[PDB]
């Protein structure tokens, strides 16, 4: 199943091309202004077959609870109301968000003890790297 070294609290240390990613998602100006200032905290936890990813930032908290492979509804930090699915591939937590026909993907991999999140919308590739506290 999902490796228990995902589990824990992560804080962002590196972000590349986040603004372009928000622009691809259609985030407005006022939200873009704030999103680039945030260095969120991500807390991954496991209760049975339910996985919970909680993102904490000064501007907004978000949380999603899900079972792998089972689709759920999600309101994103930027208030997209998506139907999303999380799957396990090759040690990669892979999330796909579906809304108004568009699609974006966030892939979370462990590398050297860090959590690297790759975010893909259209042709823009945002990479966000989290260190475990
Ligand atoms: C998530 C930062 C705080 C909230 C800022 C609101 C701007 C909307 C951002 C779009 C979704 C971001 C996806 C986060 C991926 C991750 O690093 O886990």
From Swiss-Prot:
GO terms for biological process: fatty acid transport; membrane organization. Pfam families: Lipocalin. GO terms for molecular function: cholesterol binding; fatty acid binding. Its main location: cytoplasm. The keyword Acetylation applies. The modification N-acetylserine is found at residue 3. Keywords: Acetylation, Charcot-Marie-Tooth disease, Cytoplasm, Disease variant, Disulfide bond, Lipid-binding, Neurodegeneration, Neuropathy, Transport. It is found in: Cytoplasm. InterPro entries: Calycin (IPR012674), Fatty_acid-bd (IPR000463), ILBP (IPR031259), Lipocln_cytosolic_FA-bd_dom (IPR000566), Myelin_P2 (IPR031256). (9Z)-octadecenoate binds at residues 108, 128-130. Hexadecanoate binds at residues 108, 128-130. GO terms for cellular component: cytosol; extracellular exosome; myelin sheath; nucleus. Gene3D superfamilies: 2.40.128.20. Forms a beta-barrel structure that accommodates hydrophobic ligands in its interior. P2 protein and myelin basic protein together constitute a major fraction of peripheral nervous system myelin protein. May play a role in lipid transport protein in Schwann cells. May bind cholesterol. Monomer. Belongs to the calycin superfamily. Fatty-acid binding protein (FABP) family. It is linked to Charcot-Marie-Tooth disease, demyelinating, type 1G: An autosomal dominant demyelinating form of Charcot-Marie-Tooth disease, a disorder of the peripheral nervous system, characterized by progressive weakness and atrophy, initially of the peroneal muscles and later of the distal muscles of the arms. Charcot-Marie-Tooth disease is classified in two main groups on the basis of electrophysiologic properties and histopathology: primary peripheral demyelinating neuropathies (designated CMT1 when they are dominantly inherited) and primary peripheral axonal neuropathies (CMT2). This is Myelin P2 protein. The lineage of its organism: Eukaryota, Metazoa, Chordata, Craniata, Vertebrata. The gene is PMP2.
């Amino acid at each position: 199943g999902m490796s228990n070294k995902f589990l824990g609290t992560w804080k962002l240390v590196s972000s590349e091309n986040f603004d372009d990613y928000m622009k691809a998602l259609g985030v407005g100006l006022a939200t873009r202004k704030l999103g680039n200032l945030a260095k969120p905290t991500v807390i991954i936890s496991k209760k049975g077959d339910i996985i919970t990813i909680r993102t904490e930032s000064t501007f907004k908290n978000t949380e999603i609870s899900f079972k792998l492979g089972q689709e759920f509804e999600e309101t994103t930090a930027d208030n997209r109301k998506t139907k999303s699915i999380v799957t396990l591939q090759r040690g990669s937590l892979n999330q796909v968000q579906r809304w108004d026909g568009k699609e974006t993907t966030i892939k979370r991999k462990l590398v050297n003890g860090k959590m690297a999140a790759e975010c893909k919308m259209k042709g823009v590739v945002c990479t966000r790297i989290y260190e475990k506290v």
